[PDB]
Design a protein around this ligand. Structure first.
Ligand SMILES: O=c1[nH]c(=O)c2[nH]c(=O)[nH]c2[nH]1
Ligand SMILES: O=c1[nH]c(=O)c2[nH]c(=O)[nH]c2[nH]1
Ligand SMILES: O=c1[nH]c(=O)c2[nH]c(=O)[nH]c2[nH]1
Ligand SMILES: O=c1[nH]c(=O)c2[nH]c(=O)[nH]c2[nH]1
Lengths: 301, 301, 301, 301
């Protein structure tokens, strides 16, 4: 037997950081959950009880907090890159660091129409995430995402013209509810190292903002032929607006809202044009995925 | 043996309703989860296998949807009162209906600075709830609440002067983080029936808005001596602003954020005035409760 | 305004304890989650920022661990009674202690047919719980329970003869699935204090075992007329087997499994006697409750 | 822009099946949650609003239930293979089917020491899973797993000899608690199609049983040098016992239980040899992974 793959580290490391402007009194907070998993010449910890090669997971935890003390934690793409780079630079025998960060929302409160200097609300469980893979000799691979963005539109969604055979019972519709939880990921061009990441720092917040804006506006405005067709439009727009992205991925549940036929009760009409009351379905759900990149086809387009 | 208490019905009934203004095109959505439990002369279903006294839970479910089709679902205090009243009026042998409603947020999207006519975002997992107990011969008892309102302030919270004995290790502090999930409940004066509830309908949304506003502003502005002292101020203000409330209850976790001493590492200073990076604690948590009403003491105040 | 009710303390205190028999090598583990909330002359912490009356929640936490170090943690009824008694005895101004304990399962592993001396499996998320209310001058009120005991029977459940009117669509059935999550609570006679609790210590584990045994055997063997009828039989049996119990409460969801008509596809027969494949329903669910005590009726029985 | 990857289908499809032996009266139940995602010539549903290429997710759902009606649902490796094969055979333009199955435990109750013919208990939230990828022209790739197997040992775990530098605070230990949630995956040799899967059917249940047995016995008996060293022993044993497995993967959290120094209180000794009461830590947690295969090194072993 032999070790074909191995990584290890610390998961679920909750981290808060505050910035205090002593001049203005304005405080700003950041909260995340961090995972760091390391790879390298560690196989003998598994095969030979050789712990000398293990940077303790507790030490990885300490290092996350120290790194947060000594560096900005925003944008998370930068913080993850700094953190991952540290492990491959500090430890000769560690050759990859895999850093996942979930950023939690703390949005400044407005009180009597004025932004409060030190009070915040969790205005959504929507997350902003990164996955930063720092691989010695192969640079820094970053996937950025937003997730848990839950939306619904009450009309201007359709679904007809799908394949019909002996397994099909679904009625075509020209007017339905569409609701989903948006998970959208943009994959950056490979960066050669931390310097290149730093050189693009403003692009991280800007591209997250673009992705969120495009998602919301396209969802709201597209008279949707299908989840497939709508999500493709989102992805193509995001690619058009940031050339340093290589791909955009969406993963979207179709969270079904079923009509309720009430005509058995006093002839009540609650279907089609008269549909007002619906039954949200917890499960099952459609699940629709795609990864969109830029075309290289020059014939048969 | 004998039945000392019994209630039964349907829980976790998910309900959506849409309102469509055909003139303007503006659609408005409502989503809730409903529980209805009935009491009455039902003991023989338990003791004698006498199902004749059971209004099937499936029928209770049907009735929830029918009631939502035939009535407004807002404010939830009204919808719950209509629904509960139905069961005690329709069925001679049913003498109480207990209606719990959780209202889910669907906030209209703004797209390019304009409110969208039919697209919505779950802008928070904060809920607005009601508990409506319709008891034949004893009117309608309503508790209204907001829950899952998660907030944090980064300073202007203190905790000192608490009891110190041989069980005490906690250091006094004059500057800490305070974070909580607000569960706030206001208990209405007993209503004699559905007519009286209807007579007060505008007060329901108004008092929910007041409770939320007072909660947020007091949290943000109180230089807090303790969770106890801050929550009391919230409750007293809400009581002062709605005379048809009898009590206000708060239940508040103290979701601790611990300082991290890093002085063992290169003399890094991250405590007291230099505290920037903190460890959010998932558990344990303080839990602080009180119910505030109006005073009737005339001496020894 | 005035404080009508108040309690405060520490929730979600995770506690593990090990017992080691040094002679035999056998180790035994206990794990729980504890909440302690105190009441007393504490109103001025809310009204006057008077923290002198507050036993810090952190100190309550310390006290939970110290109490676990100095006392058995089993049965939980005893541990909770010791813990609650401590607070009302130690602090003159504290007049009630409310102790909730959730006990987590760590069942000893059998390895090659022999019980292992120090290895355990979480063999179920079923819990054993207590709620111990220690009230100065009014003794110790204990509710014991089992919860999260999830069961299913594939036949020998029926539901017919229920009320049928214009709200009813449910078909009568003489053969259905019944599945539930059992929450069963037995309420003890008031105890005068810790001595009386100690005097009954063996009864706690014995009555929990009885409740669990009766629940399982009655569920398995009753050709059930309804959830109502089956749960009543459980409760009456438990009352008959422990005279120091005053009431038994059950709260049971009816976790529905729906037949799936497949006759639209190649005439497949999957209903009634030919029903093999079912759709488990996550929501909604029936919810059936009752509290059973001993009868005092001497006429009209 | 162009579609680089796409798959879509139905997730969270809950399925129950009963088998009834009419001779003996013994009934046996199976419950799972199923996801099926399809790939193929479907890009135009995304790019051109061409729904003709979409087998509706609702139809995929219907097909899951029909397949369960017409075939055994056990072992899940077989059921998933049948289900995935159906989609690539039925639809010319569908070229892959990805079938994930989570199997839920329904263990037959013993009542008065005898197995009950139709009553079951959810004896653990441990799952048995499969991931079956049916790819036209490339056969059937199966990963089998067990997950959510939660275990603890109270001694015979150690962790010393790890790297120590300026980031290290963790004390070496020669006696600690070890607790984890076991996620173990065995990856089968590629199968050429459904016939080859059928030819190995008995191996599926047998290898799951082996994996579970090896996991439990190794956990219980290994005087563990680290999570790394223990998990490697598990994997190598499983590989040795089934030649049709290519790799075994473990993913194991180290769910920490911290000692509690109580020496500040009355000199109580609760560390080292006197450690009895511990604080289970919800987060953070170590996370340790490896994939083990068979060696092909012939020099420098
Ligand atoms: O937008 C949709 N896409 C699908 O692939 C699908 N399948 C289905 O049942 N409903 C829908 N809706
Ligand atoms: O505001 C607080 N109230 C308490 O009762 C308490 N107890 C504690 O440990 N911290 C705090 N903080
Ligand atoms: O056992 C049951 N009790 C009910 O009260 C009820 N109501 C219902 O719809 N199904 C059932 N089943
Ligand atoms: O078994 C362990 N492996 C590690 O890699 C590690 N790191 C750590 O902090 N504790 C442990 N324990």
């Amino acid at each position: 037997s032999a070790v074909k793959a191995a990584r290890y580290g610390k998961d679920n490391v909750r981290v808060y950081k505050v910035h205090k402007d002593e001049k203005t009194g304005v405080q700003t907070v950041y909260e995340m959950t961090v995972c760091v998993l390391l790879e390298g010449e560690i196989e003998t910890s598994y095969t030979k009880a050789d712990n000398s090669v293990i940077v303790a997971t507790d030490s990885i935890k300490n290092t996350i907090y120290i790194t947060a003390k000594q560096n900005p934690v925003t944008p998370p793409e930068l913080f993850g890159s700094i953190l991952g780079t540290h492990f491959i630079e500090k430890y000769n025998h560690i050759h990859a660091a895999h850093v996942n960060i979930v950023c939690h929302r703390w949005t400044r409160m407005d009180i009597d129409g004025k932004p409060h200097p030190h009070s915040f609300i969790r205005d959504s469980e929507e997350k902003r995430n990164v996955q930063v893979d720092v691989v010695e000799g192969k640079g820094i691979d970053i996937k950025s995402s937003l997730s848990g963005l839950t939306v619904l539109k009450s009309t201007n969604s359709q679904f007809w013209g799908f394949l019909r055979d002996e397994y099909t019972t679904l009625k075509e519709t020209w007017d339905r509810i569409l609701s989903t939880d948006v998970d959208a990921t943009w994959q950056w061009k490979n960066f050669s190292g931390l310097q290149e990441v730093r050189s693009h720092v403003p692009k991280f917040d800007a591209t997250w903002a673009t992705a969120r804006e495009v998602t919301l506006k396209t969802f709201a405005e597209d008279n949707s032929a299908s989840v497939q067709a709508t999500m493709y439009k989102m992805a193509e727009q995001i690619l058009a607006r940031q050339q340093l992205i290589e791909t955009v991925e969406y993963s979207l549940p179709n969270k079904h809202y079923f009509e309720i036929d009430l005509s058995w009760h006093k002839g009540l009409q609650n279907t089609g044009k008269n549909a007002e009351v619906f039954a949200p379905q917890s499960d099952p759900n459609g699940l629709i995925k795609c990864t969109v990149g830029r075309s290289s086809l020059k014939s048969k387009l």
